[PDB]
C-alpha cells in the first residue's frame, strides 16, 4: 500500500571495460547495484530483468553509455524512476618522480546514475590513496616526522562530464606526496623529502582539495573525505567537507 524508493538487485559482480583518458580501453571487474522505484499500486519489480541488461550490455562504459543504460533499465523494467551504481578498481600508469620508471597504481571508482522526479543526476566517486605527514610531529621533533598512508575520497555530483583521472590528480597534487608502486632509490629520496617539505594536517588536506573542487564548474556538489591511518596510533584521523553549490 506504499511505494518503495529503491527495489532491485545488489552485489552483482560482472566484468567491465572503461575507456581511459589516454584512449585505451581498460578491462576490470565491477560490482553492480541496479534498483528501480516501485509505485504503491505495484506489488513487485521484475528482478530477472536487471541481470539481463548487464548480460545484454556491451562496449566500453562511456559516460554516454552509462546514461543510455539508466534509460534502458527504466524502459525494460517499465519504471519512471531508478538508480544504477557500479564499483570497480581503476589503474593509471604513473611515472616515478626522478627515475621515470613506469608503474601502475590502483584507485577505487564508483559511478552512480539516478533518474527521479524528471531529473537525471550522474555522480563520480574516486578513492585516491596518498601520503600525509603531520606538521606538528615535524615541528616539535629534532629529526624525523610521522608519515602515514591516507585515503582521499571525492564523491562529486557532475554538472558536466568529468574524467575520474581529473579527480585523481586534484587529490595527488594537493597531497603531501602521491603514491607510486615502483620507486628507485633516487625516487625514495625525493618522495621522503617532498613530503617532509610539505607537511599537511587532515584539515589542511580537505581544505586544499575543496578549494579546487569549489573552483570547478563541472562539479555542482561533492562530499570530500580524507582519512589518515596514523602510524603513531591504532585509530585514524578523519575530515569530511560537504558542498552543494546550488545552495543560495
Amino acid at each position: 500500500q506504499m511505494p518503495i524508493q529503491r527495489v532491485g538487485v545488489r552485489a552483482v559482480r560482472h566484468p567491465l571495460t572503461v575507456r581511459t583518458a589516454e584512449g585505451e580501453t581498460q578491462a576490470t571487474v565491477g560490482t553492480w547495484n541496479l534498483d528501480v522505484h516501485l509505485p504503491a499500486d505495484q506489488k513487485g519489480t521484475h528482478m530477472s530483468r536487471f541481470v539481463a541488461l548487464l548480460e545484454e550490455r556491451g562496449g566500453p562504459l562511456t559516460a554516454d553509455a552509462f546514461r543510455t543504460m539508466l534509460a534502458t533499465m527504466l524502459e525494460k523494467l517499465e519504471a519512471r524512476a531508478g538508480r544504477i551504481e557500479v564499483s570497480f578498481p581503476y589503474f593509471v600508469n604513473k611515472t616515478a618522480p626522478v627515475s621515470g620508471v613506469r608503474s601502475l597504481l590502483d584507485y577505487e571508482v564508483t559511478l552512480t546514475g539516478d533518474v527521479r522526479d524528471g531529473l537525471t543526476r550522474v555522480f563520480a566517486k574516486v578513492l585516491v590513496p596518498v601520503t600525509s605527514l603531520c606538521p606538528c610531529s615535524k615541528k616539535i621533533s629534532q629529526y624525523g616526522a610521522h608519515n602515514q598512508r591516507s585515503h582521499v575520497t571525492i564523491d562529486a555530483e557532475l554538472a558536466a562530464d568529468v574524467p575520474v583521472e581529473d579527480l585523481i590528480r586534484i587529490a595527488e597534487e594537493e597531497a603531501s606526496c602521491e603514491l607510486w608502486g615502483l620507486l628507485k632509490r633516487p625516487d625514495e629520496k625525493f618522495v621522503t623529502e617532498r613530503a617532509y617539505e610539505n607537511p599537511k594536517f587532515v584539515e589542511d588536506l580537505v581544505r586544499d582539495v575543496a578549494r579546487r573542487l569549489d573552483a570547478d564548474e563541472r562539479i555542482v556538489a561533492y562530499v570530500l573525505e580524507a582519512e589518515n591511518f596514523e602510524s603513531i596510533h591504532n585509530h585514524s584521523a578523519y575530515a569530511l567537507i560537504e558542498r552543494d553549490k546550488r545552495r543560495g
Copy 2:
C-alpha cells in the same frame, strides 16, 4: 583554507562498552567509535587528543541520557558548537526456541549516533537484524520445496523519544518469514521450516510490512529501512530500501 569543515576528528577507535538492556541488565560489548566536530572557517585544527580522552574518562553503562551527556561534554571539551558521536557494537539477546524453549543467544549489530548541528540535538538508532526469507514464487511454481535464504533487515531510526533496540528487532523478527535461533532442536527445526514455508515474503513485502509498523510509532520521526536477501539460487542479493520522514 578559509572554509569551515563539517566533520573533523578520530575514526575507528575500538574501546570496551557497557550498555543498558530493556530489562535494565547491563551487557558488556566492544565498540568502534567515531568522534568528530565542526570546525569554523578561521580555525586551523581541532584537538584529536581530546576525543580519546573523553572515551577513557567516560565510564558506566551507555544509557540514552548518558549518550546525550557525552555529546555535550565532547562539544564542551573540544570547544566546538557542532559535532557527532557514532558507536557500533555487537548486541546479544537471550532467545527462547519456539517449541523446546531451549534458551540461546543471538547477536545483532547496533549503531547509535548522536548529532548536534544548527543548535539541534538528534539521536539515531540503526540495528541489523538477521532473519530468514522464503520466495513466494518458488513456493507456487514448484511441485515441492521453496527456496529460502538468510536476510538482513536494517532499521536506521531517528528517535524523537528513546526506543530500545529490542523494540526495533521485534518489528523485523515478527515481520520476517521466520526468526533466527542459535540452538534449535528437531522439534524446533520442523517449526521454523514449516512456518517459513507458511509465510512466504518478497523483499518488497518485507520492507512494506516493516514500514507500516515503523510508521505507527510516534517515537520514530524518520527512518531508512533496508532489506537484503542473500538468494540461494544466485550469487547476488535482492534489495529494497524505504525512506520516510514524518516531518514531510
Copy 3:
C-alpha cells in the same frame, strides 16, 4: 643471523589476463603475493624487483607462463627458493537448466607457485558458490526444507596441469543445486525441485566431492572445505577434508 623463509611484497593489486578452457582470453584484476627465501648471511631482499616483474610481465597467464614467472623471479631477485601467489575473480558463461538463458557466474581463483629444496610445486584453489539443502529439515517437515547458499573451496596441489573449470564442475555437479545468475520461471522451478530431490548434509557434500578428487591422478593432495551459511542460524556449518595421496 637466521634465514627468513618468506620475504617480499604483499597485496599488490594488478591487472591480469587468463585463458579460458574455451580458448578465450579473460581479463580480470588480481592480487599478488610474491616472496623469496633470505639466507641467514643475507641482510635483505630487493623489494623494487618484485613490482618490476609484474610490470615487465605480459601475455595470458598460462600454466607455463606461471612457472616461467616463478623462475624469472628467483633469477631476478638472485634467490634459490621463493613463492608466487595471485588471487583473482574468474567468470564462466553458464546456461540455465530449462530455458538455456546464458548468464555469467563469479568464482574466486587463487594460483600458487613455490620452489623450495630443489622441488617446484603448483597449487590450484577455487572457491565455488553452490546451493545446499538439509536432508533432516526435509525429512521431519510436512512442507518445505531449509536451503542455504554454500561455498565449496578446493585447494589442490597439482601433479598435472588442471583447468580451474575442471574443479568448478566437480563442485557444481556434487552440490544439491548449482548457482546461476539469470533464471527464468521455468528455471526457478527446476532448481527448487532438484535441490529438494537431492538434499545433502555438509558431511555428505565434502565426502561426495572428495571421492572425485581422490580418483583424479592430476591431484596429488588437496584441502577441501564446505561452508553452509545456514538460513535458520546466524552461524555456518563447516566441514574440511585433508588428503595427501603421497602418504603411505
Copy 4:
C-alpha cells in the same frame, strides 16, 4: 561416503567472553567461535546443535585450564575422540604514555586454539600487535625525514607451557621501531617520532629480532611469525614470514 572427515562443526559463532589478565583481572570481550570434531568413516554426521549448547552452558573466565576443560567436554558431549576449538577476540591493555604517563587503552586481536588429534592435546596462541615501522633506507639516502608506516606483527605460538598474551605483545612492542598509543601529548608525540627515527628497522630485521626472543622461550615449542608493513610510499605492503619448530 566411506571416508573420515578431519573437521566437521559450526563456524563464525559470535558469543560474549570473559578472559583472565596477567594481573588476574577479568576483561569482557566478544568472541567468534569455531568448534569442529573429527568424524569417523562409518559415521554419517556430527550433532551441530551440541556445539552451541557447550557455548551457552560454559561460563566464567576463559582460563587456560578452563580452555582445556572445554576441549575435553566438547569431545565428551559430541562423542568424538578428536577435535579443535578456536576463538578470536579483541584484547585491551591499559597503556602508559612514554613521557606524560597519560593512561590509554590499546586493542589487540587474539586467537586461542586448542586441538586434540592422534591422542595429543596442543594449545596455540596467536596475537596481532599493532606497531610503527621506519625504513632505514629512507633515513640514510634522504637529507631530511624518514618514511614510516603502521605495521602488523603476528605471533602464532604453540605453547608447551602457558604464556600470557602480554608476554607475546612485549616481544613485538619492544622489538618494533616504536609502540602505538591511543592518547599521546605533545611531549609524547616528540618521543615517538624521535625514537622511531632513532631505531629504523626493515621488515627482515623486525622478524629476525622477534624470532631470537621467541627462540629463547622454553614455553614456546613452535611459532609462525609474520610482519607486514603498510608502506606509506606505495599502495602495497612489505612482508616477512619466519616459521620455526624447536622439535626439528
